[PDB]
Amino acid sequence: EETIPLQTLRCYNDYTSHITCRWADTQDAQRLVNVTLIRRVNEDLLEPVSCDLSDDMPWSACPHPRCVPRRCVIPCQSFVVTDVDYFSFQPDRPLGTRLTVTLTQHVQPPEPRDLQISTDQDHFLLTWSVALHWLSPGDLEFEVVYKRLQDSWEDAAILLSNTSQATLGPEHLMPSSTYVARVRTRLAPGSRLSGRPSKWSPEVCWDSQPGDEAQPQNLECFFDGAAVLSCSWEVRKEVASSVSFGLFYKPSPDREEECSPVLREGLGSLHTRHHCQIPVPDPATHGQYIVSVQPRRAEKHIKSSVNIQMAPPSLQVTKDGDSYSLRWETMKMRYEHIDHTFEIQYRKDTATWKDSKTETLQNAHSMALPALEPSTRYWARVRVRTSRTGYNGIWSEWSEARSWDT
Amino acid sequence: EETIPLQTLRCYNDYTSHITCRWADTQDAQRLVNVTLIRRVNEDLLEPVSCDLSDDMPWSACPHPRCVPRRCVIPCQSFVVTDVDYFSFQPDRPLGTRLTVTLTQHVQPPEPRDLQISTDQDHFLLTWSVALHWLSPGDLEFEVVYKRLQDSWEDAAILLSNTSQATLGPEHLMPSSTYVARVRTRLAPGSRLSGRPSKWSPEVCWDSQPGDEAQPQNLECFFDGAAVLSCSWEVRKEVASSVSFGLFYKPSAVLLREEECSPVLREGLGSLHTRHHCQIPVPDPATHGQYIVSVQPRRAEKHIKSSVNIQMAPPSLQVTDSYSLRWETDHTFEIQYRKDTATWKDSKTETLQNAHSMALPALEPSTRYWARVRVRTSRTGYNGIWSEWSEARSWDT
Ligand SMILES: *[C@@H]1O[C@H](CO)[C@@H](O[C@@H]2O[C@H](CO)[C@@H](O[C@@H]3O[C@H](CO)[C@@H](O)[C@H](O)[C@@H]3O)[C@H](O)[C@H]2NC(C)=O)[C@H](O[C@@H]2O[C@@H](C)[C@@H](O)[C@@H](O)[C@@H]2O)[C@H]1NC(C)=O
Ligand SMILES: *[C@@H]1O[C@H](CO)[C@@H](O[C@@H]2O[C@H](CO)[C@@H](O[C@@H]3O[C@H](CO)[C@@H](O)[C@H](O)[C@@H]3O)[C@H](O)[C@H]2NC(C)=O)[C@H](O[C@@H]2O[C@@H](C)[C@@H](O)[C@@H](O)[C@@H]2O)[C@H]1NC(C)=O
Numbered sequence: 001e002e003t004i005p006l007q008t009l010r011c012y013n014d015y016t017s018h019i020t021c022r023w024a025d026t027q028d029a030q031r032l033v034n035v036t037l038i039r040r041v042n043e044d045l046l047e048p049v050s051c052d053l054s055d056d057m058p059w060s061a062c063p064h065p066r067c068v069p070r071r072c073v074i075p076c077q078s079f080v081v082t083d084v085d086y087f088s089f090q091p092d093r094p095l096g097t098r099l100t101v102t103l104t105q106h107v108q109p110p111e112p113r114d115l116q117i118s119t120d121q122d123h124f125l126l127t128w129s130v131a132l133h134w135l136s137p138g139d140l141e142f143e144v145v146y147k148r149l150q151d152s153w154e155d156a157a158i159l160l161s162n163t164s165q166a167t168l169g170p171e172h173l174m175p176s177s178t179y180v181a182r183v184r185t186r187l188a189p190g191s192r193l194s195g196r197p198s199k200w201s202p203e204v205c206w207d208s209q210p211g212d213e214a215q216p217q218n219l220e221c222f223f224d225g226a227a228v229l230s231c232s233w234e235v236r237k238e239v240a241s242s243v244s245f246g247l248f249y250k251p252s253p254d255r256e257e258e259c260s261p262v263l264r265e266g267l268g269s270l271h272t273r274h275h276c277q278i279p280v281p282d283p284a285t286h287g288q289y290i291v292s293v294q295p296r297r298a299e300k301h302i303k304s305s306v307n308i309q310m311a312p313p314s315l316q317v318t319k320d321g322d323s324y325s326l327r328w329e330t331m332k333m334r335y336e337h338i339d340h341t342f343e344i345q346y347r348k349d350t351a352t353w354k355d356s357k358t359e360t361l362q363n364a365h366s367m368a369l370p371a372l373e374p375s376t377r378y379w380a381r382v383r384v385r386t387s388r389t390g391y392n393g394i395w396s397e398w399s400e401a402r403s404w405d406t
Numbered sequence: 407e408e409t410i411p412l413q414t415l416r417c418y419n420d421y422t423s424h425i426t427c428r429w430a431d432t433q434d435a436q437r438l439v440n441v442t443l444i445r446r447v448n449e450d451l452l453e454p455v456s457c458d459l460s461d462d463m464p465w466s467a468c469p470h471p472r473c474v475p476r477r478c479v480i481p482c483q484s485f486v487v488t489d490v491d492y493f494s495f496q497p498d499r500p501l502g503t504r505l506t507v508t509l510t511q512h513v514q515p516p517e518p519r520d521l522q523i524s525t526d527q528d529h530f531l532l533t534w535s536v537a538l539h540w541l542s543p544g545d546l547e548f549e550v551v552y553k554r555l556q557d558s559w560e561d562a563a564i565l566l567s568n569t570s571q572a573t574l575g576p577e578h579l580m581p582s583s584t585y586v587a588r589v590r591t592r593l594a595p596g597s598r599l600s601g602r603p604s605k606w607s608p609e610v611c612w613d614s615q616p617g618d619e620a621q622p623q624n625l626e627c628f629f630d631g632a633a634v635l636s637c638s639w640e641v642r643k644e645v646a647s648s649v650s651f652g653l654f655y656k657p658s659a660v661l662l663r664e665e666e667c668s669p670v671l672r673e674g675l676g677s678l679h680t681r682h683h684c685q686i687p688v689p690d691p692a693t694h695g696q697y698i699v700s701v702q703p704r705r706a707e708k709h710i711k712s713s714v715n716i717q718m719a720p721p722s723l724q725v726t727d728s729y730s731l732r733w734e735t736d737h738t739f740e741i742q743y744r745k746d747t748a749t750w751k752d753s754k755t756e757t758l759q760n761a762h763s764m765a766l767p768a769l770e771p772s773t774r775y776w777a778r779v780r781v782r783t784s785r786t787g788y789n790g791i792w793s794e795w796s797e798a799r800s801w802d803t
């Protein structure tokens with residue numbers, strides 16, 4: 001982006017005898033290189049310049065906290081409107097490098113492009129062209145790499161072609177996935193030329209044969225060569241939420257087992273990877289396994305006696321004299337012996353259950369009520385639950401609300 | 407990982423006539439599978455519970471933002487204390503996958519470990535180990551990959567060993583650089599085992615042989631096979647801030663003139679270097695099949711036109727009733743005078759164009775003032791910088 005010496009150099013003259021130059025350097029650079037100010041006479045003569053250290057930089061700022069300013073004086077006997085001095089910096093030693101390139105051994109073939117996919121049933125034909133007689137198409141060979149959209153490039157299958165197309169089939173692709181492919185051009189083993197391969201083409205992207213998107217997929221197993229067979233597979237996040245899969249394995253015929261525990265990991269935004277470690281205690285004897293991912297026996301055990309929601313009680317209102325009493329019955333349970341607790345509530349019509357007189361009774365079937373307001377409409381509800389050590393549950397829904405007036 | 411239908415299920419019964427269950431699917435899952443509630447009568451016997459949609463979830467929360475809650479009613483005569491029901495959920499269709507695996511065709515050997523570098527003069531001995539008669543060291547082959555720290559793994563050089571050390575020299579390594587290496591285990595070609603390599607060891611770093619830090623390094627030129635030879639190289643930022651490098655080429659009776667390539671594109675690689683690129687045009691590769699390519703300091707000069715960079719000498723000054731400033735040098739003069747407890751950015755400041763003289767107003771019959779001047783040109787195609795101040799001169803009024 002332009003040396004610091006060259007940025008900081010300002011050379012001003014008295015237009016009679018002098019030129020004074022001021023330029024700087026960094027210490028950072030000087031631990032590696034030093035440079036002289038050089039002035040040049042004609043297309044040939046290049047004269048050194050005599051500078052000494054200056055503690056200041058009054059003509060230009062130096063962008064770097066570690067500058068070493070210079071100040072130099074160059075004698076002259078002449079100045080004319082057209083005069084231009086040309087200034088340079090020579091480094092303390094020769095620095096450089098060379099390479100002798102034999103073109104035939106330094107070929108980077110052009111990158112493929114116009115990458116394109118067409119389905120033919122369950123195969124996909126991948127075409128591309130290359131912009132190109134020193135390098136003929138027969139010098140070329142192509143390298144295609146493909147992976148599911150959710151995978152590293154790290155882990156991807158290659159496919160080689162001597163022409164500029166390849167067919168990808170069901171031996172290469174898993175069904176109902178999005179695949180990505182890319183292609184680069186390589187020199188042919190047979191070419192009289194070598195170098196290195198092109199940069200990759202841009203990516204093309206496509207869906208494989210539709211199949212069933214719910215099916216778990218990509219079941220893989222690898223044996224450590226000792227005592228463990230590690231299997232992994234994927235299933236859609238949404239399907240794992242309605243279905244519990246297990247891993248089951250059994251030796252192929254010469255009793256069928258569940259692998260446990262299964263660990264889980266995100267795999268992109270739609271799949272979960274699960275892993276399992278199958279123990280193999282004798283790979284010599286039983287060295288072929290048949291392994292399945294399939295629905296587990298996953299049950300919620302629900303003990304009836306301990307999950308009872310009784311039916312709501314029937315409720316009625318009674319007078320008898322001028323004192324009113326609430327009564328309530330619950331459906332006969334064949335002959336069960338089971339204590340019941342009831343919760344009883346009543347409302348002034350113009351008021352809210354939330355803030356109401358809510359007494360609670362074990363094994364009672366009525367409740368006498370206090371005296372109450374002149375000619376008001378009233379409401380009442382009851383609910384039951386079991387209340388005995390063999391038993392448990394939730395309240396019954398409320399009885400129908402029973403109205404009435406004074 | 408309980409499923410949503412199962413986490414959600416609650417079944418309460420009236421201990422007389424039936425069981426009521428409530429539970430929930432998600433909309434998201436329903437796109438891929440629906441599920442039926444199932445009540446297991448006995449070991450051999452499952453039966454479908456008929457559920458229908460509910461607006462609510464009066465018995466358990468649903469941990470998805472879009473559930474499809476159900477309410478089922480299963481009738482029963484008969485209940486008693488010892489009773490446990492087993493409930494589950496059947497998919498709308500068979501789901502599964504099945505791989506049949508022969509262990510010898512499916513082996514992944516163990517990750518290498520304990521990567522070390524030792525130096526042997528200018529070589530580096532990398533060692534490691536693999537913790538294992540089913541799989542034996544002789545089944546094994548090690549693939550080692552290495553690279554400069556600042557490079558990607560994309561096409562790093564592989565070196566293969568069939569024992570658990572490898573050597574890396576100056577043939578493999580750029581001097582004065584930091585190398586990172588990792589190793590993984592593979593099945594030997596001649597092994598009757600097949601599978602896939604181990605995952606990579608942890609990385610190890612080391613500093614390659616020192617060389618001449620200051621040189622440009624890593625010149626690479628590649629020819630596209632038609633008309634162009636792209637070249638790249640690295641120079642250290644320190645050096646780059648002192649030397650402009652160029653790229654020069656000559657193609658292979660007597661030899662031709664050595665030519666300069668441009669433009670040179672620059673990009674910031676790693677902490678120490680910047681990377682440069684140049685495009686060389688090659689017209690007749692079948693005749694000039696060899697190009698010697700050099701990176702060296704260029705003719706990078708600053709053109710300074712004398713006439714537009716004049717700074718003059720300070721004028722000479724004097725002072726001589728009224729006091730008069732006179733000076734000797736198409737000029738512009740600035741004249742300053744001052745009081746003695748006041749500085750200059752307080753003092754009176756004045757421009758005089760092609761005057762060599764200046765008269766002064768009333769002054770204090772007490773004080774002893776100071777005065778400087780300086781100059782630049784006005785000559786019309788000319789420019790420069792103000793002169794230094796003239797000798798500051800004194801007098802007592
Ligand atoms: C570029 O030019 C400068 C100054 O001339 C060099 O910096 C100086 O390098 C000298 C070696 O020629 C050092 O001299 C030594 O000094 C010690 C005590 O200070 C003496 O006992 C002994 O006789 C040495 O000769 C000197 O220390 C150093 N100046 C500084 C910064 O103090 C420069 O060398 C390089 O620059 C600096 C930043 C230092 O780190 C150097 O050692 C370094 O190599 C010259 N650069 C090159 C690459 O040739
Ligand atoms: C799980 O079962 C649910 C609900 O029964 C299925 O979703 C439902 O699919 C019905 C298709 O059978 C859709 O009803 C349709 O209405 C439209 C008009 O709006 C008609 O064109 C069409 O012929 C039907 O009459 C309905 O869209 C849908 N119900 C809900 C609440 O979404 C589900 O099937 C799957 O989900 C959607 C994408 C469906 O439309 C189907 O194409 C799809 O397979 C069942 N799950 C599965 C995997 O079968």
Ligand SMILES: *[C@@H]1O[C@H](CO)[C@@H](O[C@@H]2O[C@H](CO)[C@@H](O)[C@H](O)[C@H]2NC(C)=O)[C@H](O[C@@H]2O[C@@H](C)[C@@H](O)[C@@H](O)[C@@H]2O)[C@H]1NC(C)=O
Binds near residue numbers: 568569
């Ligand atoms: C595994 O690596 C060994 C140690 O480096 C191999 O020996 C070397 O590899 C070459 C085979 O391509 C061989 O010609 C070299 O001269 C030899 N170098 C040294 C100094 O060890 C070994 O190769 C086998 O054993 C050698 C001695 C030869 O007889 C080869 O024909 C063998 O393939 C490799 N191990 C095996 C058994 O594959």
Ligand SMILES: *[C@H]1O[C@H](CO)[C@@H](O[C@@H]2O[C@H](CO)[C@@H](O)[C@H](O)[C@H]2NC(C)=O)[C@H](O[C@@H]2O[C@@H](C)[C@@H](O)[C@@H](O)[C@@H]2O)[C@H]1NC(C)=O
Binds near residue numbers: 160161162163
């Ligand atoms: C690139 O060109 C050819 C057409 O696709 C391939 O030739 C094939 O050679 C096989 C030899 O055993 C053989 O199956 C086929 O007859 C033939 N394929 C057909 C019918 O088109 C070629 O494969 C190479 O050719 C053979 C002779 C060997 O040299 C192999 O090592 C080659 O792989 C194709 N590409 C590659 C790289 O495989």
